[PDB]
């Protein structure tokens, strides 16, 4: 108990181990059943503790390495009268273990914490109430994106519709993907050198318009 | 009536029970994940113990634990002991606990919300004001009316566009 699984969960996993022991027992060896059953029972209990206790599941060999690191640090602190540094632990772990490896193994073993962890004496606050949402764009971001699209269309209208269309096809404004020169040339019916040339001249006219009006500079961050 | 008995337990969309990385690079997550994990572990172990033909006592215990898992998931602490994470007396927050109460969904996020274009400060008597007036600090009003201010700055020459004005006010 107290290793991350309920009493009943441990009991059911030991029941699975007991079923295995039953199906693998050989009475001919004159051994009592308990001696063979205890092996599989401990085996199943430990497999369950290793496989289910963590909210972020860790492979069983990695959990064994983590527990070895735990025991090692605990013996080192029981002999040192203080918590050991990464370097002392890497020493005691043997070869192939440098301090950076101990640090990475500890970072990989960090368990998550509850978003419902309380803050304060009277339960008026949660821990999740301080986590900003980074994924969904802010109104400022969406507004800047819309103004960018509108300014790019404002600048793309100063081109002819063909050079504007070539730029839009080549950069992905139209269908979401960027086409090769051969595809834009097969669409407009022109050589890849010609389509790349009108792309260059459209970019050049846009560069001139931008040096003149400076309307798109502020969007470059 | 038989629909009051569950065959397929629904699972909440994951964004409403997030698994997010906080500032320091560590992870914070909702209790519904641990409740669902309890449920799925017990249900999978039941499916296996059935596939292997286990005795009656064992399947009975497994089914009892499965019911109590579903109960903790839907309304923890309602029947029996509340399900707590290891090393803590704190009950886990089930769906019932998310809906009902002072901090529940209705009272906390639906009948009242935190809101944009809002501020607060210490009050002061100001007897020169007419009845229809109040004294608003300049910086408070700048932030509260910020988009209007960006627009009016673009109308005048104070900035080339909205984004330049915002960077200038930063």
């Amino acid at each position: 108990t107290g290793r991350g699984l309920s009493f009943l969960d441990l009991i059911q996993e030991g029941n699975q181990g007991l079923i295995r022991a039953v199906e693998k027992f050989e009475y001919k060896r004159r051994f009592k059943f308990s001696t063979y059953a205890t092996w599989w029972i401990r085996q199943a209990i430990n497999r369950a503790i290793a496989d289910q206790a963590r909210t972020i599941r860790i492979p069983v060999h990695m959990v064994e390495t983590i527990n070895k690191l735990s025991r090692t640090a605990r013996q080192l602190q029981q002999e040192l009268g203080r918590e050991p540094t990464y370097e002392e632990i890497a020493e005691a772990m043997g070869p192939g273990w440098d301090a950076k490896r101990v640090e990475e193994t500890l970072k990989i073993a960090q368990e998550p914490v509850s978003l419902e962890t309380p803050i304060g004496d009277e339960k008026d606050s949660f821990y999740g109430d301080f986590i900003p949402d980074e994924h969904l764009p802010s109104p400022v971001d969406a507004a800047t994106q819309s103004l960018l699209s509108e300014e790019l269309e404002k600048a793309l209208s100063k081109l002819s519709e063909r050079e504007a269309m070539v730029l839009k096809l080549r950069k992905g404004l139209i269908d979401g993907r960027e086409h090769t020169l051969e595809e834009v040339g097969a669409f407009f019916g022109v050589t890849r050198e010609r389509i790349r040339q009108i792309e260059n001249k459209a970019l050049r006219k846009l560069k001139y318009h931008e040096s003149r009006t400076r309307k798109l500079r502020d969007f470059l961050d | 009536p038989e629909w009051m008995i569950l065959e397929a337990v629904p699972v909440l969309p994951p964004d409403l029970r997030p698994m997010v990385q906080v500032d320091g690079g560590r992870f914070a997550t909702s209790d519904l994940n641990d409740l669902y994990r309890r449920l799925i572990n017990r249900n999978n172990r039941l499916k296996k113990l059935l596939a292997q033909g286990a005795p009656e006592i064992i399947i009975r215990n497994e089914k009892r634990m499965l019911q109590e898992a579903v109960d903790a998931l839907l309304d923890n602490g309602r029947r029996g002991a509340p399900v707590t994470n290891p090393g803590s007396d704190r009950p886990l927050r089930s769906l019932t606990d998310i809906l009902s109460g002072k901090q529940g969904r209705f009272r906390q996020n639906l009948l009242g919300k935190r809101v944009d274009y809002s501020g607060r400060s210490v009050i002061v008597v100001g007897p020169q004001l007419k009845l229809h007036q109040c004294g608003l600090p300049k910086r408070m009003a700048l932030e509260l009316f910020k988009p209007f201010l960006l627009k009016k700055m673009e109308e005048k020459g104070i900035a080339p566009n909205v984004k330049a004005a915002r960077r200038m006010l930063e």
């Binding site: 009943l8 | 006592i57 009975r60 215990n61 009892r64 029996g80």
Partner: peptide, 14 residues
């Protein structure tokens, strides 16, 4: 009332 007590009783029958 206590599921582990119930199971320990069921175990005590066999």
């Amino acid at each position: 009332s206590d599921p582990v007590r119930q199971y320990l009783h069921e175990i005590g029958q066999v």
